[PDB]
Amino acid sequence: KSLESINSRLQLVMKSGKYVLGYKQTLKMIRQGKAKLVILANNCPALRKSEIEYYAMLAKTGVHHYSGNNIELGTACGKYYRVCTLAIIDPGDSDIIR
Amino acid sequence: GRMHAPGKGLSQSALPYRRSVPTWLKLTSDDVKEQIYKLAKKGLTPSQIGVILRDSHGVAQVRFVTGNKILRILKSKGLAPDLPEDLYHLIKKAVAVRKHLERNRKDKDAKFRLILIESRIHRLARYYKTKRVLPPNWKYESSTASALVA
Amino acid sequence: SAKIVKPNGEKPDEFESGISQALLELEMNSDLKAQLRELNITAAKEIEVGGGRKAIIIFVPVPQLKSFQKIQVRLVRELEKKFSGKHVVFIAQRRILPKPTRKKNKQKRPRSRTLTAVHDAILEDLVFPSEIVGKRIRVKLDGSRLIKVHLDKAQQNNVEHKVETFSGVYKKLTGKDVNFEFPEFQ
Amino acid sequence: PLAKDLLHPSPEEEKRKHKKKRLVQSPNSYFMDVKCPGCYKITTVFSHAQTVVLCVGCSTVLCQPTGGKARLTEGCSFRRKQH
Amino acid sequence: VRMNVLADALKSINNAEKRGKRQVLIRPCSKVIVRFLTVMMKHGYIGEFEIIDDHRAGKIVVNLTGRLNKCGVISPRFDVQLKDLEKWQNNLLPSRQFGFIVLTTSAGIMDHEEARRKHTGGKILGFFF
């Protein structure tokens, strides 16, 4: 039930909230301190995963390890390209509890 | 009987003969409206909006109190979903069945159910293109439908 | 004659000036004029019902029908006190549109303007202190139709004496026989 | 029986028949005012509610969805709404 | 799925009449059914019938007088002219002394004797005798 719920919340973040897709933009958003949630596919390189976890620990932001891969994370975002890392600027749908 | 099942069930909803709003309902038309709006921002489809409005806020029929249906209100304010509720759910079911099938070759029963699901999807899509709800060139492709739902 | 509250298409009036009087000297009542001054009347009509009993029919605009019914049960008694021995009913002018025959641009006729919808609508707001919980139509062996209307039965104190006047006024402005009965619990 | 009165049957056989098979359709459900203990506000809930109903003033559940009828939590009183 | 409301109604009256019931309930009502039953009643074949009005399609309860033999329907509403009305009349009716054929004409829903009286044809509806 967790996977379908997180997929539905991810869909509702799209079309209703501000997000960003990709690795470089995710790092850029984290180091500006305006990313509220970082979602990583398990297909992510381990070095990249560890570095993003360290960045989020520095920025005090939550990391969710998505139970798919970059293909299924791209599908969950409504896109036709693989996304391996994404950052949520603001949910607009109670994905991140206030 | 059912469209794709040998069932002849009768479970329905008996709408009462009294179309008038109940006296004990203090909610006026516009109040029920912002209730719909806030619960549409939460992502609830019109069926769920009607269900929770009947269950919790005690309104019997949105149409009886406001004069318009739930989807009409959502469309008038322009926050109605791009795909229809039932077609969206049918596509979601088809995507789930295909995802289960790509791991299970020997599930021929799942293949049969998938054929039934896609048959209903195509018939509903033909109906919606007839009423110009959908674009005339709107087609359901099994490969690209995964990005449309969930 | 002071006729301040009577808007409609045609400028004169006959005996409707009297109802407009009785509404204007309904001033300094028990706090009704505050929610009544923004209100208006379309037409009025006196007909004979029952034996030697008169009933007054009041025609009102459709948009203000709900605001009227919100206070209808209040001002009916003062209007009956003004005109003793008479019953007051509030009806909306619904402007029946003719059915489009085969005989230079007219829009599609709304279903609210259709005649059957007008008739059962003016049946519903006529008996507003009660509500129609069921309708029954009997064909009396020769093509004539008699309509039985089932009321709420929740109240038996202020409508049971006006069913004759209801039937008379409905025969007057609709032309079909209707009788009223109160069924048991459902 | 060849002379059953279809026009005026007694309410016993009207309540026992199915909702659709009655002379006029009547829903078997109703609305109902529930009073949770320890709170003042009155909540109107569908009798056959499919969702858990919560107070806005207290984090306590009122009814649990079941097959046909919502089961109220113990200690909650209830009445009908205009029969 | 129900495609001919009048057919199901007329079959219901015919079956209840054969079973000897005093009243019959037909579920889907329509203007055509009301006119057909009015034609039957004006000829005395049925008693007073009552229309139950729900906000859906209403229901009709018909008082059966016991003097009806058959009230069948012609499902394909054939175009019936005055020239070939006699062939329909002697193919569907038991005799020439009685039995009536209801056909919808431009002047209304109406039996074949009055249709020939006012010189008009129309589409076939059914027959009763």
Swiss-Prot record, chain A:
It holds the Pfam family Ribosomal_L7Ae. GO terms for biological process: antimicrobial humoral immune response mediated by antimicrobial peptide; cytoplasmic translation; defense response to Gram-negative bacterium; killing of cells of another organism; translation. Keywords: Acetylation, Cytoplasm, Isopeptide bond, Phosphoprotein, Ribonucleoprotein, Ribosomal protein, Ubl conjugation. The modification N6-acetyllysine is found at K18. It is found in: Cytoplasm. Transmembrane segments: none annotated. It comes from the Eukaryota. The keyword Kinase does not apply. One of its GO terms (molecular function) is structural constituent of ribosome. Its main location: cytoplasm. NCBIfam families: PRK01018.1. Component of the large ribosomal subunit. The ribosome is a large ribonucleoprotein complex responsible for the synthesis of proteins in the cell. This is Large ribosomal subunit protein eL30. It comes from Homo sapiens. The gene is RPL30.
Swiss-Prot record, chain B:
It comes from Homo sapiens (Human). This is Small ribosomal subunit protein uS15. The modification N6-acetyllysine is found at K26. Belongs to the universal ribosomal protein uS15 family. The lineage of its organism: Eukaryota, Metazoa, Chordata, Craniata, Vertebrata. There is a cross-link at K26 (Glycyl lysine isopeptide (Lys-Gly) (interchain with G-Cter in ubiquitin)). Component of the small ribosomal subunit. Part of the small subunit (SSU) processome, composed of more than 70 proteins and the RNA chaperone small nucleolar RNA (snoRNA) U3. The modification N6-succinyllysine is found at K26, K33. The gene is RPS13. GO terms for cellular component: cytoplasm; cytosol; cytosolic ribosome; cytosolic small ribosomal subunit; extracellular exosome; focal adhesion; membrane; nucleolus.
Curated annotation (Swiss-Prot), chain D:
It comes from the Eukaryota. InterPro entries: Ribosomal_eS27 (IPR000592), Ribosomal_eS27_Zn-bd_dom_sf (IPR023407), Ribosomal_zn-bd (IPR011332). Zn(2+) binds at C36, C39, C55, C58. It is found in: Cytoplasm; Nucleus, Nucleolus. The keyword Zinc-finger applies. The modification Phosphoserine is found at S10. Keywords: Cytoplasm, Diamond-Blackfan anemia, Metal-binding, Nucleus, Phosphoprotein, Ribonucleoprotein, Ribosomal protein, Zinc, Zinc-finger. Residues 1-15 have a biased composition (Basic and acidic residues). A zinc finger (C4-type) spans 36-58. One of its GO terms (cellular component) is cytosolic small ribosomal subunit. Residues 1-22 are annotated as: Disordered. Binds 1 zinc ion per subunit. GO terms for biological process: cytoplasmic translation; ribosomal small subunit assembly; ribosomal small subunit biogenesis; rRNA processing; translation. Its cofactor is Zn(2+). Expressed in a wide variety of actively proliferating cells and tumor tissues. Its main location: cytoplasm. Belongs to the eukaryotic ribosomal protein eS27 family. Component of the small ribosomal subunit. Part of the small subunit (SSU) processome, composed of more than 70 proteins and the RNA chaperone small nucleolar RNA (snoRNA) U3. Component of the small ribosomal subunit. The ribosome is a large ribonucleoprotein complex responsible for the synthesis of proteins in the cell. Required for proper rRNA processing and maturation of 18S rRNAs. Part of the small subunit (SSU) processome, first precursor of the small eukaryotic ribosomal subunit. This is Small ribosomal subunit protein eS27. The gene is RPS27.
Swiss-Prot record, chain E:
Gene3D superfamilies: 3.30.1370.30, 3.30.1490.10. One of its GO terms (cellular component) is cytoplasm. The modification N6-succinyllysine is found at K87. GO terms for molecular function: RNA binding; structural constituent of ribosome. InterPro entries: Ribosomal_uS8 (IPR000630), Ribosomal_uS8_CS (IPR047863), Ribosomal_uS8_sf (IPR035987). Belongs to the universal ribosomal protein uS8 family. It is linked to Diamond-Blackfan anemia 20: A form of Diamond-Blackfan anemia, a congenital non-regenerative hypoplastic anemia that usually presents early in infancy. Diamond-Blackfan anemia is characterized by a moderate to severe macrocytic anemia, erythroblastopenia, and an increased risk of malignancy. 30 to 40% of Diamond-Blackfan anemia patients present with short stature and congenital anomalies, the most frequent being craniofacial (Pierre-Robin syndrome and cleft palate), thumb and urogenital anomalies. DBA20 inheritance is autosomal dominant. This is Small ribosomal subunit protein uS8. It comes from Homo sapiens (Human). The lineage of its organism: Eukaryota, Metazoa, Chordata, Craniata, Vertebrata.
